[PDB]
Amino acid sequence: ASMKFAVIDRKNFTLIHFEIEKPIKPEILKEIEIPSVDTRKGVVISGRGPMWMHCFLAHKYHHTPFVAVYDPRLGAVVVQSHSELREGDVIDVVVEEIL
């Protein structure tokens, strides 16, 4: 039960948001079931969690056109791409959680 993912498909990318419920150990990277996605599109990843969670997930979608990582102050920052965008580009995205 210890993490939830929410997946949202957009014309140009799939947003993947993760939420940690119980506290977690790094073993969990062996077990966790990653959401599958249209790989013809790039991917944006968000969530509060340790950096290792973000890195792990980013690597897992490295075959997609691009992977970007959400920053509350900025939007989604592209950290690697095969095609559509360049490392360091920013996709204009805002994520909000019910208050």
Next chain:
Amino acid sequence: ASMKFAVIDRKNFTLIHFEIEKPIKPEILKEIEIPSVDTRKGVVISGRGPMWMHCFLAHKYHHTPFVAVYDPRLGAVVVQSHSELREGDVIDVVVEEILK
């Protein structure tokens, strides 16, 4: 000028420490010049920075045997590997930073 790297070699991996000094924009990922390393060995990355910096760096060493990311509470957590360790393994290394 706005980021420094330090490299420390070990038998089984190369530690890469980064430090941000001025605040930075994501454009910087286009300019950054990454330290080169013995690629026969995996790599450990440590440094305070936004998630995107960590991810960026981790991708850049993806040809090495493994990439692990340092967590003060835990050690260095493997987040991808081609060869020596498994995702989620923890290298038991203690890193300490000094004011100077």
